[PDB]
């Protein structure tokens, strides 16, 4: 990390507040005989797990000599949390950041990035995320100083989770993990935590979650789905499939139901993907072999970012 008790010292920069997040037992929602522990990545300073990947890319690339503040331009295609965390850290590190995303995206997504002074390049709506990806590649191809964050392939991504997320989990659960479950977006969280757990001698079963409507790891066809943050519709190079014991599909509507229930049951307020992870954890926890075992999963992002999405439409409609 190195470990740094935030509750007892004054940080020199906001990036020292990233990681070392809390862990929380699922209680009222957990009606099973297994313990379920939630790694609260929603509590990062920009409210999601991507703060760890942002920091890892800036810190490790600079240290290796591949980024130079005020010269390098960091470019990425993202209509979600990676673009936020890149924009937030690029600002305080003196990098120009360009994020591409379709024209059709909500004012909130565009506006949050411009607060942190990122340049947002909007691509034609009809081309979808493919069009935003192509624009980011062309920008980086044309300009020597422009480089791709490359969230889906960068070696920094699994590495940060192996060095931080996974050893935090290990200490918090007192070296006791029987199953680790995470939705795969880039695959960094699952891959890095699975690496750390195995290095510590844990026999935890490693479970990857994906949307039923885009079941790519399971061998099916990519498609549009609701579970923001996971399910890219290809197998990311970051993901090391050799570490996975089971791929479990979760339907977007089970994720959405579970998110709504979690707020009221346990006070956990998250996005679609924390609903999918908890649905999957509870499913595993019902398996009779898991009686008395400890299941760990992740709450990737805080709910306030999703107030305008399909996630809480049922509440919106009700209001």
């Amino acid at each position: 990390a190195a470990p740094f008790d935030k509750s007892k010292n004054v940080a020199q920069s906001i990036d020292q507040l990233i990681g070392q997040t809390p862990a929380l037992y699922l209680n009222k929602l957990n009606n099973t005989k297994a313990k379920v522990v939630l790694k609260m990545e929603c509590e990062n300073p920009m409210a999601s797990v991507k703060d760890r990947l942002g920091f890892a890319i800036y810190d490790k690339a600079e240290k290796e000599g591949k980024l130079i503040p005020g010269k390098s331009i960091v470019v990425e295609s993202s209509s979600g949390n990676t673009g936020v965390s890149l924009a937030h850290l690029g600002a305080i590190r003196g990098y120009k950041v360009i994020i591409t995303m379709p024209e059709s995206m909500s004012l909130e997504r565009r506006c949050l990035l411009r607060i942190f002074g990122a340049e947002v390049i909007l691509t034609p709506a009809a081309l979808g995320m493919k069009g935003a990806v192509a624009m980011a590649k062309k920008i980086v191809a044309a300009n020597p100083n422009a480089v791709l964050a490359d969230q889906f392939a960068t070696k920094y991504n699994a590495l940060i989770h192996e060095e931080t997320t996974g050893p935090e989990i290990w200490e918090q659960t007192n070296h006791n993990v029987d199953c680790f479950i995470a939705g795969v977006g880039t695959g960094g969280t699952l891959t890095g935590v699975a690496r750390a757990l195995k290095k510590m001698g844990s026999h935890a079963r490693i479970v990857a979650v994906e949307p039923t409507e885009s079941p790519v790891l399971s061998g099916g066809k990519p498609g549009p789905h609701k579970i923001q943050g996971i399910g890219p519709g290809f197998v990311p190079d970051v993901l090391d499939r050799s570490l996975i014991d089971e791929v479990l599909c979760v339907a977007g509507d089970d994720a959405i139901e579970t998110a709504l229930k979690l707020t009221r049951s346990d006070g956990v307020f998250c996005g679609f993907s924390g609903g999918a992870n908890v649905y999957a954890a509870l499913k595993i926890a019902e398996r009779p072999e898991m009686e008395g075992k400890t299941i760990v999963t992740v709450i990737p992002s805080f709910g306030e970012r999703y107030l305008s999405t399909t996630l809480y439409r049922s509440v919106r409609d009700e209001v």
């Binding site: 949390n81 880039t186 789905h225 923001q228 943050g229 399910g231 890219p232």
Partner: peptide
């Protein structure tokens, strides 16, 4: 689809 995807938003990551």
């Amino acid at each position: 689809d995807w938003s990551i």
